[PDB]
Amino acid sequence: RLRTSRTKRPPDGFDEIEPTLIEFQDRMRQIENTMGKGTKTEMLAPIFQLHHQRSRYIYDLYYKREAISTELYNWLLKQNYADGNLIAKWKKPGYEKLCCLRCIQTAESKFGSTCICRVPKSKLDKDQRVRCTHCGCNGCASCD
Amino acid sequence: ELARNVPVNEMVQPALGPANPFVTKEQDSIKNSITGYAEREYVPNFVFNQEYYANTHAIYGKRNFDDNEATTSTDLKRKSQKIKERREDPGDPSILEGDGAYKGPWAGY
Amino acid sequence: DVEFPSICERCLGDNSYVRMTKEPLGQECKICSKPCTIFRWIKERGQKPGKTQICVGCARYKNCCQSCMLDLQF
Amino acid sequence: SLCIKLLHETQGHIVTMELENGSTYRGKLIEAEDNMNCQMRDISVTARDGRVSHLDQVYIRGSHIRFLIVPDMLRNAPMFKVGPGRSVPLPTRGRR
Amino acid sequence: GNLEKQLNERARKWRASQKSKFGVKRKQGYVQTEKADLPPEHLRKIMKDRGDMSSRKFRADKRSYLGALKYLPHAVLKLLENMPMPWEEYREVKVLYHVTGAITFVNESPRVIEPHFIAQWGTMWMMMRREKRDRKNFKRLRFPPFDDEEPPFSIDQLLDLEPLEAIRMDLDEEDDAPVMDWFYENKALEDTPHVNGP
Amino acid sequence: TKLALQKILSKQIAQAVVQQRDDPVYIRYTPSNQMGQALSKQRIIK
Amino acid sequence: TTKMVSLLNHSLNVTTKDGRTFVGQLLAFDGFMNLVLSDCQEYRHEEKRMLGLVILRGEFIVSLSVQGPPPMLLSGPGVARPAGRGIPLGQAPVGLA
Amino acid sequence: MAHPKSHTNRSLLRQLKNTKFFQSTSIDWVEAGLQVCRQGYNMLQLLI
Amino acid sequence: TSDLNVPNLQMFGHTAEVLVARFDPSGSYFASGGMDRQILLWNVFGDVKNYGVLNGCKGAITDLQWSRDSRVVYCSSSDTHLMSWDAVSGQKIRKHKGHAGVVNALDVLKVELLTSVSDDCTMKVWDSRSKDCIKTIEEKYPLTAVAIAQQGTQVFIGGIDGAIKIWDLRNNHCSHVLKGHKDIITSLAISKDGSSLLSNSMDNTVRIFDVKPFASAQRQLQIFEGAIHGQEHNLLGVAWSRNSRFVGAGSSDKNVYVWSATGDLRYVLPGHEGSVNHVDFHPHQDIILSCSSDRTIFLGE
RNA sequence: CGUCAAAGCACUUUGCAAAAGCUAACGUAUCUGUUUCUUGCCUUUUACCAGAAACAGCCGUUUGUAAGGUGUGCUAAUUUGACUGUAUAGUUUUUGUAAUCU
Ligand SMILES: [Mg+2]
Ligand SMILES: [Zn+2]
Ligand SMILES: [Zn+2]
Ligand SMILES: [Zn+2]
Ligand SMILES: [Zn+2]
Ligand SMILES: [Zn+2]
């Protein structure tokens, strides 16, 4: 993950996108330091937020604007700058706007069911449109 | 655990008694637990889930008195259309500090 | 077969269809001081989940509800 | 090939063979080749008509053979799998 | 209208039932998935917020936090088993942690190629002898390295520094061509046909 | 006697391995006229 | 020639260029279709002769046909036990309550 | 030297990973060591 | 009233809902299969224990059919396949492919001919060695159950439309429909002689029809109420007795139903823990087989 | 390399089961504990000393099998297995010394 001055030089298309990744890292640090205003699980929601956003940025670089070479993209996934499993989920129908990967797997729930965010809002009542407790998600379903 | 297979027409099974007046409503019902009867049943997950889903939706509709919708295939998308238009747009990643900053599934209302 | 705890339908929700979990030996009976299993469910969406507080031996010797302790007859 | 392998197996026994003439030969087989050229000893030739003569050493050419009556106890001779390149059916231990 | 729509709805419901019963990836009506990996900042934030456990905000987790004392020596073994070797500046380890932040097992085993391992350690032997001969003043590290009552080091400022340089022989450009690009890696030939896989 | 002793022995021996036995059970439940009212409809539990 | 392998161990009758017929069990064939017949009988016009183990040359053979077929689960977790039927007091489908 | 006895494959770490109370990630070794030291110190303090 | 050691025998096994369990034509053996992707073989008389398991199927056994030889078994899988299992040795004989969905039902012929339907709205007839569908019939809505006549030219296919289709394999003329049902036909079974068809449908009525080239109009013989279907849309089976005078069925209301073929209910016996998928009668004695989605199969009289 | 057959394949996660039969490294590595004996130092116990026998625990390894994950495909890719696998009209078998009558 961490790169030294004497490490192998990343592929060519890296430097122009290096600064924004640096900004992502900076704010992740700030979120780590920032404390208060939530329950034991709510304070850990913004982490997944930024993480999904960062992975989506890389996904947008490759699959929507073809701004990065395939070599650089494999390098980025190998350096954990993006979550390979989350991107794999984004590449199949029904999970285009997946929030995180803990809201899809059923072994982490009380009754073996996915999260509320995975459910389309059309069949969900108006009153029970609440923030996810896993990551604060406000609706994953591809329809919305 | 009736061990003998027996035809139908002798299944009336009458109590054959004066049917005691003295029993009250709290004794009219047979039970295992103090509150009522409970016994095993092999329901597959999906059917129990979807029917419970429908009953919960019906209860919410009865409570809020707001039941003015239909159901179809294209109707699902049509219902989703207005909830989508009420929602603010999701920003574009790499726009990151205000003025169209990216917010995806976390976008509010 | 350790099947059910006795709960009245006033605090079992107005839905005829609810889901609940058990955690064996999860609490000491507040009367028996005995190891007993807990049961958690949801009365209705939007309120804090309920749970049984007394063992099966009690609420039966008292003919009472394990969660609300209102007598099951009056 | 398995047939010439059995013919080679026969050498040293007494084998009866008849040629394109119709004469049958009764003697001890001493040599055999892939062409089925045969060398024989103490042959008792029975002609097509029935005349019986005797021979001592012959070298019958293979191309003039109809069939042979191999001794019976060679029925249990092993028929080995033959690979592509191998020219003699032998037990194998490599790939094939 | 009528027949076509009614039959369409019936086929819809029947196909939904069939998909639930015999789905492509469904076990008991639900889709199957694998337990994934959370970002390391999750664990970092957990350990930062917990601190010394001197807050009532986490007062419900203390019993579990203390019960992991039973398995702590296992964590010690897994940590010491995967200590970085002299030739690597840093080593990234797959880890498994309690959501409480109670315990943290390094979930890996240090599997190496035996000839490669012996070659690397012989190289270390050469370089260490050379440096002990050439240093002429060797200042041994003091013990204990940190002051007794010093607070434990903050991970926030340990990730900003350049990791310095390790013990690495100057492998010849031509004589040691075969092993140049992978002699000092952690998983040496992981992505090449020389090893079966990850 | 063998069955009873085996059962009691397994119960006693079972008292460090992480327990992994999770599978739903469904039960058909019938309420019964607690405080008058109008009884209640049949329920089943997950 | 894969079909020819299927005739191994079958009983065969072979008509020869001479006009005779050999009947017997096939042991092994050849690329030139030299045949090895075990327990062979001779059909000389019909006269019967026991021959035994016979190797026919490829040239001698004209046609061949078969006359007879060639001479010729662990456990499970299931356990049964008697039991009776327990009548329920309800009349409703499993899903509906 | 004893010939190893037959036994089914079992491992504590996999059993723990199966539960919902344990997660997984990849971190620097020194960070994991600091975490283990801090956790052990906190545990020892809580029993004292 | 039979040779069974016990009047009622509970069979324990399988790891999920059992979907089918069919008697050997000889009446001496039978097999069972379900959602556990496994086939269990049993012994009708004696200790009633397993003598083999048929592993290798990569899907739930939606249906299976014994062979008249009582030596090979044909299994239909939910994974769009049709395997042929050698009962006496347990090896893969052949795997017939060609469908495009879950294969719902299977039937065998008096001649080595197999038939099947699947959710791809198709019916396929298979030779036991062709490994390919020699004939294919395309419909508009998915088909649910099949019945092949032992004579070998008419096939009855029931699907979503609620009307039984009769297909002549040689004729390919289909302008003859057994109308009368109003919902999904779960199962079909032909009488032993080949004159009467037993139909069960999700419209809650178990009906009986006649299978003859000629009719006096209203081919419907009679209907039976009571057998109700739940909301899980299961495929509930029906059976023909060895004498073809008692018709049997299973219902999702935890009831096994036997009728006298004259409209008079005969058996109402409960005893199941879940929806009862399949019911069958012994071809020699008065045994009735039950198969429910609760990992258990019941013996009978 | 060729033909035939069936299996999507490569990598990977988890569960279950098994691992000497013909004297031989499941692990070319290497710890701890209990019981029963014999010792060493010993004011008594734990903690110990070092040999044996009988037992267990832990760190690991291999194989079969089942259900999944990632990446590529089914408009082909790879793997596994089996194979009595090859030319050739010019003398030793397959491009006729045959017909003719007896
Ligand atoms: Mg004392
Ligand atoms: Zn979400
Ligand atoms: Zn989420
Ligand atoms: Zn969620
Ligand atoms: Zn109550
Ligand atoms: Zn109590």
UniProtKB/Swiss-Prot annotation, chain D:
Keywords: Cytoplasm, mRNA processing, mRNA splicing, Nucleus, Ribonucleoprotein, Spliceosome. CDD domains: Sm_D3. It is found in: Nucleus; Cytoplasm, Cytosol. GO terms for cellular component: catalytic step 2 spliceosome; commitment complex; cytosol; nucleus; post-mRNA release spliceosomal complex; precatalytic spliceosome; SMN-Sm protein complex; spliceosomal complex. Pfam families: LSM. Residues 2-74 form the Sm domain. It comes from the Eukaryota. Belongs to the 40S cdc5-associated complex (or cwf complex), a spliceosome sub-complex reminiscent of a late-stage spliceosome composed of the U2, U5 and U6 snRNAs and at least brr2, cdc5, cwf2/prp3, cwf3/syf1, cwf4/syf3, cwf5/ecm2, spp42/cwf6, cwf7/spf27, cwf8, cwf9, cwf10, cwf11, cwf12, prp45/cwf13, cwf14, cwf15, cwf16, cwf17, cwf18, cwf19, cwf20, cwf21, cwf22, cwf23, cwf24, cwf25, cwf26, cyp7/cwf27, cwf28, cwf29/ist3, lea1, msl1, prp5/cwf1, prp10, prp12/sap130, prp17, prp22, sap61, sap62, sap114, sap145, slu7, smb1, smd1, smd3, smf1, smg1 and syf2. Belongs to the snRNP core protein family. This is Small nuclear ribonucleoprotein Sm D3. The gene is smd3.
UniProtKB/Swiss-Prot annotation, chain F:
Homodimer. Interacts with cyp1 and the small 23 kDa subunit of the splicing factor U2AF (u2af23). It is found in: Nucleus. Belongs to the SNW family. Signal peptide: none annotated. Involved in pre-mRNA splicing. This is Pre-mRNA-processing protein 45.
From Swiss-Prot, chain H:
It is found in: Nucleus. It comes from the Eukaryota. Belongs to the 40S cdc5-associated complex (or cwf complex), a spliceosome sub-complex reminiscent of a late-stage spliceosome composed of the U2, U5 and U6 snRNAs and at least brr2, cdc5, cwf2/prp3, cwf3/syf1, cwf4/syf3, cwf5/ecm2, spp42/cwf6, cwf7/spf27, cwf8, cwf9, cwf10, cwf11, cwf12, prp45/cwf13, cwf14, cwf15, cwf16, cwf17, cwf18, cwf19, cwf20, cwf21, cwf22, cwf23, cwf24, cwf25, cwf26, cyp7/cwf27, cwf28, cwf29/ist3, lea1, msl1, prp5/cwf1, prp10, prp12/sap130, prp17, prp22, sap61, sap62, sap114, sap145, slu7, smb1, smd1, smd3, smf1, smg1 and syf2. Interacts with prp1. Involved in pre-mRNA splicing. May be involved in endoplasmic reticulum-associated protein degradation (ERAD) and required for growth at low and high temperatures. Required for pre-spliceosome formation, which is the first step of pre-mRNA splicing. This protein is associated with snRNP U5. Has a role in branch site-3' splice site selection. Associates with the branch site-3' splice 3'-exon region. This is Pre-mRNA-splicing factor spp42. It comes from Schizosaccharomyces pombe (strain 972 / ATCC 24843).
UniProtKB/Swiss-Prot annotation, chain I:
The keyword Zinc-finger does not apply. GO terms for biological process: mRNA cis splicing, via spliceosome. The keyword Repeat applies. It is found in: Nucleus. Keywords: mRNA processing, mRNA splicing, Nucleus, Repeat, WD repeat. Disulfide bonds: none annotated. GO terms for cellular component: catalytic step 2 spliceosome; nucleus; post-mRNA release spliceosomal complex; spliceosomal complex; U5 snRNP. InterPro entries: G-protein_beta_WD-40_rep (IPR020472), U5_snRNP_Component (IPR052234), WD40/YVTN_repeat-like_dom_sf (IPR015943), WD40_repeat_CS (IPR019775), WD40_repeat_dom_sf (IPR036322), WD40_rpt (IPR001680). WD repeats lie at residues 13-52, 56-95, 98-136, 138-177, 180-219, 230-269, 271-301. Involved in mRNA splicing where it associates with cdc5 and the other cwf proteins as part of the spliceosome. Belongs to the 40S cdc5-associated complex (or cwf complex), a spliceosome sub-complex reminiscent of a late-stage spliceosome composed of the U2, U5 and U6 snRNAs and at least brr2, cdc5, cwf2/prp3, cwf3/syf1, cwf4/syf3, cwf5/ecm2, spp42/cwf6, cwf7/spf27, cwf8, cwf9, cwf10, cwf11, cwf12, prp45/cwf13, cwf14, cwf15, cwf16, cwf17, cwf18, cwf19, cwf20, cwf21, cwf22, cwf23, cwf24, cwf25, cwf26, cyp7/cwf27, cwf28, cwf29/ist3, lea1, msl1, prp5/cwf1, prp10, prp12/sap130, prp17, prp22, sap61, sap62, sap114, sap145, slu7, smb1, smd1, smd3, smf1, smg1 and syf2. This is Pre-mRNA-splicing factor cwf17. It comes from Schizosaccharomyces pombe (strain 972 / ATCC 24843) (Fission yeast). The gene is cwf17.
